[PDB]
């Protein structure tokens, strides 16, 4: 029928006549009078001194009559031009200790101001370009940058912000994606994205609605001007108590559109950055007009950054594969390949991997089986994530064939910037600013991941978060109140402490070789808790302590401390192939050397390095069968270099380091610790499981003037999850000296301590002088280099 009076309605029971909401233009339909009653534009969007005190001319976009403040439909500059007040940006920011909200407000509202493609570096253009945004940053809580999820695209990141899930869990693994169960494709442009079958998890607007918290319509048809969106949000905030939503969302497609066109370093970028700042100012002027500028929590958040890319820098699969017409490629700043699924696609995953592996000297992309991607990306577990993946170098593109490159008729590309690269790339980092009563005042917080924001916004709204992948409590330092109180998880499996129980006479099944007060110097942060049911033993030695699993026949963790001045010894010739039985552990619960001799592809290594033994007598402990783990010979090149060369180097740089190393089983690549039933590989003819990865947590003192074992204040951690591979094809320069490639491989596979905890069932840093919230921040820190 008619949209009279009910423009941008939030009807839940049932709109009477037609459709009049924000998303009626794009999807479904609208009434006929929508564009006049609801999309008024007369006089523009700012008040003139000529029209101050006007008579309510309803046809106007916004009103400058004195009755506008009652209905909340004034122009955002009405108080400034018609009542002599100042702009919000011209006021000195005053510390907001408590929310200054109207009488009926039950919780301080949350407005999410999302900007598409706002590079974190844009914040340095200063107040001459973005005075409003600079006031939000300098007076609220801001990080230097926020880390998006991989892929660093719009839809995966905006939905990750709304759900707190990795894209592999909430389902929006890309702007483009194919679902084999649906047998359909999903795209930014289309009506398919409106179908609810694509969206997993529980987004914030659903979490709020299910718990009684009203949410305004987060989305807007593209034909709704930004000034009308701001005016609509301010009109909703003037609704009565029983109808007023508590959470709102404003999304701007800029500066993404200009960043794509002119690049991130173009002088033209100051024009859209000014228009965004004016939209922010219109919102803050409108909130000050409603006296809500010291009541509402405002989150100025971006989805991803922006990198200089050009048509010039494009890699083509036709330069690597013989036939590219039998595969489908999701191209651009990333690569996802799948079979055309025709009758005879004739397609082999690792054959295509092999054809893409280290073929050109300056190759600007690397192929991966999705299971072998760096575990920090968490982009391996979804039916919509193809098995083959390409990590594209920053500043570069990957395409199927050269004809796919679209350029202007002139000798110039259509785009100068793009986005979607690895989320540790500095140009992909985006902006986070929190401004309001619940956020801290003039506070700078360390960079963090956007998966953590859903928990925070649930805390800001009094909502119990749906199960997600943020670490609840790791961002408490952002808020001045309403924090979540994290609890250290209960230990599930309690260790045995075995003494000398066996005679060594019923031992050495194929092997040959020619307590608690001195090991505390190696277990600085308490023993890790085993959060799953298992049987395991604590083993003490002069140089290291270990939690040996009687089930997996190997330690779950091995802890030891190396000092700045520790000297590296070699492995003696008479001890190179020495393995000694451990009289504390039953022979039936120990590994045996017969299995390694029979397994022609599996060697063995040691979790504690014999290279760092404190004395010749102590070195015999490092060769115990309980310190031994299965290791491919190709992996031993990485492990031996790390143990012999890098541990000493790190200890000399960081004034000593404490190292915790152990195995990882993830055969179903869900990022979670495997049970026995899921382990799919053992050492030949034995029950010794093979780890898919090996982790190490290298902790030292943040204050490098104090040694690692005498550290007072905060800790400095760098962890990694190295893939246990029978080859080093991931490292193109592995033929050269290990000093050229081993550390580059380890930096690529950096990881959160939290990532290691998901994959092991262990819980670290349980005995520290720091608060648990501070430790949760430590566990969620990524050394990106
Ligand atoms: C990111 O968060 C996700 C939760 O939002 C985690 O995914 C969850 O993993 C759980 C592992 O047990 C699944 O539990 C299953 O729940 C169903 C309920 O009907 C039951 O089968 C079982 O309780 C359980 N299944 C098994 C085999 O134990 C959750 O279903 C699952 N959640 C979703 C939404 O899929 C991710 O693991 C987590 N990612 C990381 C890296 O930690
Ligand atoms: C590009 C513009 C036209 C805007 C497009 C908006 C579009 C992506 C939005 C509009 C409606 C959204 C769905 C709706 O809010 C409800 C749900 C249920 C919830 O449990 C999961 C998310 C889902 C399906 C929303 C997905 C995003 C939609 C389609
Ligand atoms: Ca698993
Ligand atoms: Na062998
Ligand atoms: Na190689
Ligand atoms: Zn119009
Ligand atoms: Zn300038
Ligand atoms: Zn975007
Ligand atoms: Zn973009
Ligand atoms: Zn094979
Ligand atoms: Zn892929
Ligand atoms: Zn015998
Ligand atoms: Zn495991
Ligand atoms: Zn990794």
Author numbering: 56 to 569, 588 to 858
Published text:
In this work, autotaxin from rat (r-ATX), which is a phospho­diesterase producing the lipid-signalling molecule lysophosphatidic acid (LPA), has been used as a challenging case study. ATX is the main producer of LPA, forming the ATX–LPA signalling axis with LPA acting as a multifunctional lipid mediator by engagement with six dedicated G-protein-coupled receptors (LPA1–6). ATX regulates many pathophysiological processes [e.g. vascular development, neuropathy pain, fibrosis, rheumatoid arthritis, sclerosis and cancer]. The X-ray structure of r-ATX (MW 100 kDa) has already been determined through conventional cryo-MX, giving a good control over crystallization, with minimal optimization to obtain sitting drops containing micro-crystals. r-ATX was expressed using a stable HEK293T cell line and 800 ml of cell culture yielded purified protein with a final concentration of ∼4 mg ml−1, which is inadequate for batch crystallization.
We applied our iSX approach on a challenging project, autotaxin, a therapeutic target expressed in a stable human cell line, to determine the structure in the lowest-symmetry P1 space group at 3.0 Å resolution. However, application of iSX on micro-crystals facilitated the determination of the first RT structure of r-ATX at 3.0 Å in the P1 space group, with an effective data collection of <1.5 h. We collected still images by raster scanning an X-ray microbeam while continuously moving the plate without rotation. As we did not benefit from any rotation information, the indexing has been quite challenging for the triclinic lattice. However, we managed to iteratively refine our cell parameters from an initial heterogeneous distribution of cell parameters. Subsequently, 29 550 indexed diffraction frames were merged using the partialator program within CrystFEL. We determined the in situ r-ATX structure at 3 Å in the P1 space group using molecular replacement, followed by refinement in Phenix. The iSX dataset is limited to a lower resolution compared with the cryo-SSX one mainly due to a low deposited dose at RT.
